[PDB]
Design a protein around this nucleic acid. Structure first.
Ligand SMILES: [Mg+2]
Ligand SMILES: [Mg+2]
Ligand SMILES: [Mg+2]
Ligand SMILES: [Mg+2]
Lengths: 145, 49, 102, 48, 112, 154, 116
RNA sequence: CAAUGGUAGGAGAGCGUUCUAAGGGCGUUGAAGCAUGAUCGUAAGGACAUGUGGAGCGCUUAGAAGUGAGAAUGCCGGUGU
RNA sequence: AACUUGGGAGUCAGAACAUGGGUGAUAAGGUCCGUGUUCGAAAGGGAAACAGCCCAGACCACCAGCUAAGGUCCCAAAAUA
RNA sequence: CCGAUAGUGAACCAGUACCGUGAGGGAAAGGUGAAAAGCACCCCGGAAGGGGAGUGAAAUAGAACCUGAAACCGUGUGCUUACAAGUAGUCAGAGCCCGUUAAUGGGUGAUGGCGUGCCUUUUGUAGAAUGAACCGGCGAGUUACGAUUUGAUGCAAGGUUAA
């Protein structure tokens, strides 16, 4: 138990990032975003505290799918009522409520712990060029190739 | 020898084995008899020969 | 002013004035120990040793050769009348670094 | 029909958090100065 | 600074008396007496007797003013239950506990 | 479970009551009746071969003779039982608190003179035994008793 | 001679109850469940004293990967290059140098890069 | 230098409890019990301190056993849900 | 290592997998034999979870290192090689 | 040899309370203190109880009276807890309280990893197979005689006695 550094809220510094979803594939942007807001790009990563940064995804209506999973790739959900299952294709989610699409794609790549939910709360997705978070002074973030 | 320092002959005495007292002794539950059948019953076993 | 020493089967990052706890060494209380396996020196001037740095002894004063807090190792198999219990207390040596050499 | 397990002390004391009585709806009697039930006769004096 | 009164082996179940005892803990003596006289539970007159006894003990043994007195603590703990039975159907007999209570009230002037 | 009073009827039927099957009220698990394997009256004495008995006596006496714990006196000639005189005799002989006095035969006066001194025991040459010799810190033996013991013990 | 079981059952049960201090409800008061929980705790502690070393190794790995990718270099390549260079600093010490002295870790990155 | 997972099961070494023998001790300036504590040993387990308690009890060596419980729809009591 | 003489046992319900076969229907997580392994009595890593499959046998510490089977976009350690 | 679940069923008005038509069956229940010195008097209360005063070395020794465990029930608090999925622990950990048989200290615990009780019986049990409401006490390889084997010890072509 000798000398491993542990981060706590008294020395965590979270920053803000904008990520453009124009011309990017759903899963490949989502995995990198999940890595950012988990805090895994930080040298000071600590698994029991929420190190990591806030992320804004701005365009999010320009996200693309390979193949033909626009018409395939159906999202199902149950209402907890008998026969209470309904579905929406990925293309319909993109044209109506594209913020939910990217939110859910990134959220599914985060752990289902309490920390995971808290970290997924640091994600703000907008289906259009503009965001209201100018007071937070975000920096543009380019996705790794 | 003295009556407060008396010693038996080495190798003459040995503690007897008490059976069915805990599992660290090795003879705890079934007491060295295995599990079932005549051999496990009290007064079980069969006439010699 | 910041060095990496190799002792026990481990490595420890030390700077002068620090108290370290290592696997038991063969010294007495109040003696001086010299670590001669130094892999890295930091601070303003950096010496990155391939195996060791070559030279760079680290001297320390040894105090309180002791035994750690008692662990009680216990294990049991479930429906088999099998369990084992035994204590353990690791010996350790407490040293205080007083010189990083290079 | 019959309990399947004990009720722990925690569960019991949770169930009886709302098992209590309220203080009486009482007011000082204007004539005699002693407490009485509001809209009732003051039993110490007998007024109103 | 403190006055005590205990009523031992009161033939009322302590779970039943602690309901009324919850209303007067930490209250002023006058308000406590009014609460007791106006709440309609079987345990109210019994607790009132212990309260008045504690107040009298205060006044008579320690000479403290019974106007600055607060109900410092009030509790009931179990006493020696009495075991009885009820004849149920088919010849079976079911136990009945007639429980008893040790009721303690201490009043204080809240000073030293 | 046989010697305990009563308990000869089956306390309740074997099946149907929901209770553990029982057969007597004095079974060992029941309170108030039945000890399984208790003490029984018996003897604890055994025998050792005769030569071993005499070797044990000789070894006890030899141990008491190498520790300088063997004092030989000529005679006792106590004409009346008097404890005080025997105590003075023992003190003049510088004997430890625990001492075994050995006479040739049963000296009534010496026996009576040493009954009430605590830690002094009287015996004859034929009455010697290993436990008594090993208990005493010193032996005070009369010359005639010494010769008799030498004759008897080989 | 008879011996009744006085003052050994209590001491043995009590020092297990004391060892179950802080457990929920029945598990710090009743001997039967306190013993089971102390047993399960001994087993868990034995397993976790081994799990701990691999958990901390993977923590150090993650930190080194994050520190290395700031120099456009993967963890795999960095470790391979440090082996090529003959450097034998553990993952623990690498993580601490990256946390404390960024310049020194940059120097280690270059010395592993030129060992290509 | 080598070995040390383990059930039926074999073997060995020990920890405690009551009693007895002998020696040596402790106790109203407070014994045994009980309670608490952050103490010691590889385990069984051994101390120390301080409260409670108010007259008995350790240690050594050796002898005997009604010598160790979590389970038997166990038995008796007490107390819950 | 093996064998002989003696003291003490327990076992006589086995399971899956692979493979050579009978039976059944080139059915069964079927049943009966031959052969090996594992479980039984085996923790650890992998196979999502999963006695019997794959890797591998826990004397006890360590916040050291190298590998096996399996892996290296995120959950989740390591190639968006 | 037993020291109130033991030792007689019965240490105490016990073959008695009690059960049965009857033969019969059959309990449970010891301990104030050295001395009764067993609380004069005052106060609340109808009383029961209590608080003073006093007796006593001691009164949480006050008559249910030596000690007074555990289950169980309360009253206060230091730290925590109302977005969370829990065989309840363990490993890692900040914050907040505290300070010990002073030693890399004690209490709690945001959050992360791992983690389906125990016994029995089974090829195999988290098992929705068995058993235990909880706590305490009691509760199962013994003794005698013979046989055999191994260790020990004497003596040895001899060894040993039984009544
Ligand atoms: Mg009827
Ligand atoms: Mg079950
Ligand atoms: Mg269930
Ligand atoms: Mg049941």
């Amino acid at each position: 138990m000798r000398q491993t550094f542990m981060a706590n809220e008294s020395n965590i510094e979270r920053k803000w990032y904008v990520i453009d979803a124009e011309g990017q594939t759903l899963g490949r942007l989502s995995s990198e975003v999940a890595s950012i807001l988990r805090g895994k790009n930080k040298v000071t990563y600590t698994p029991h505290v929420d190190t990591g940064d806030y992320v804004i995804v701005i365009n999010a209506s320009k996200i693309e799918f390979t193949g033909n999973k626009e018409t395939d790739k159906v999202y199902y959900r149950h209402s907890n009522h008998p026969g209470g299952i309904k579905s929406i294709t990925a293309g319909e989610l993109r044209r109506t409520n594209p913020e939910r699409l990217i939110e859910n794609s990134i959220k599914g790549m985060l752990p289902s712990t309490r920390l995971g939910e808290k970290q997924g709360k640091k994600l703000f997705v907008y289906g259009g060029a503009e965001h209201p978070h100018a007071a937070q002074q975000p920096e543009n973030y380019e996705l790794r190739g | 020898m003295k009556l407060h320092e008396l010693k038996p002959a080495e190798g003459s005495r040995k503690e007897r084995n008490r059976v069915g007292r805990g599992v660290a002794t090795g003879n705890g539950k079934t007491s060295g008899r295995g599990h079932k059948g005549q051999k496990a019953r009290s007064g079980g076993g069969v006439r010699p020969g | 002013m910041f060095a990496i020493i190799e002792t026990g089967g481990k490595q420890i990052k030390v700077e002068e004035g620090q108290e370290i706890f290592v696997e038991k060494l063969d010294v007495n209380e109040g003696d001086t120990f010299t670590f001669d396996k130094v892999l890295f020196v930091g601070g303003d001037s950096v010496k990155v040793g391939a195996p060791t740095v070559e030279g760079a002894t680290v001297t320390a004063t040894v105090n309180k050769q002791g035994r750690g807090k008692k662990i009680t190792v216990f294990t049991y198999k479930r429906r088999k009348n099998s369990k084992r219990k035994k204590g353990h207390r690791q010996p350790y040596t407490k040293l205080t670094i007083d010189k990083i050499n290079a | 029909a019959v309990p399947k397990r004990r009720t722990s002390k925690t569960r019991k004391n949770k169930r009886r958090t709302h098992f209590k009585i309220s203080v009486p709806g009482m007011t000082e009697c204007p004539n005699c100065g002693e407490y009485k039930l509001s809209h009732r006769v003051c039993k110490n004096c007998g007024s109103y | 600074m403190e006055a005590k009164a205990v009523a031992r082996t009161i033939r009322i179940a302590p779970r039943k008396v602690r309901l009324v005892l919850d209303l007067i803990r930490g209250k002023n003596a006058a308000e406590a007496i009014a609460i007791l006289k106006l709440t309609n539970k079987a345990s109210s007159p019994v607790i009132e007797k212990v309260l008045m006894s504690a107040l009298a003990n205060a006044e008579h043994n320690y000479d403290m003013n019974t106007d600055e007195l607060v109900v410092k603590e009030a509790y009931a703990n179990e006493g020696p239950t009495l075991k009885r039975f009820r004849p149920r159907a088919q010849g079976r007999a079911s136990a009945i506990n007639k429980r008893t209570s040790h009721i303690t009230i201490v009043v204080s002037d809240g000073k030293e | 479970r046989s010697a305990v009073s009563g308990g000869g009827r089956k306390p309740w039927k074997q099946k149907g009551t929901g209770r553990a099957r029982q057969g007597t009220i004095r079974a060992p698990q029941w309170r108030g009746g039945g000890i399984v394997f208790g003490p029984t009256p018996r003897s604890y004495a055994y025998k050792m071969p005769k030569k071993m008995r005499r070797l044990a006596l000789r070894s006890a006496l030899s141990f008491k003779a190498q520790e300088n714990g063997l004092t030989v006196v000529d005679a006792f000639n106590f004409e009346a039982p008097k404890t005080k005189e025997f105590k003075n005799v023992l003190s003049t002989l510088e004997q430890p608190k625990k001492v075994l006095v050995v006479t040739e035969n049963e000296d009534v006066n010496v026996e009576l003179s040493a009954r009430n001194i605590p830690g002094v025991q009287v015996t004859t040459a034929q009455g010697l035994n290993v436990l008594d010799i090993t208990n005493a810190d010193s032996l005070v033996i009369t010359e005639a008793a010494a010769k008799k013991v030498e004759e008897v013990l080989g | 001679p008879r011996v009744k079981g006085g003052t050994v059952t209590r001491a043995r049960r009590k020092k297990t109850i004391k060892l179950a201090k802080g457990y929920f409800g029945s598990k710090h008061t009743l001997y039967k469940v306190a013993k089971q929980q102390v047993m399960k705790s001994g087993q868990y502690a034995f397993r976790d004293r081994r799990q701990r070393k691999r958990d901390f190794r993977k923590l150090w790995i993650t930190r080194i990967n994050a520190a290395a990718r700031q120099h456009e270099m993967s963890y795999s390549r960095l470790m391979n290059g440090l082996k090529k260079a003959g450097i034998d600093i553990n993952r623990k010490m690498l993580s601490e140098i990256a946390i404390s002295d960024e310049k020194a870790f940059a120097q280690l990155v270059t010395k592993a890069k030129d060992a290509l």
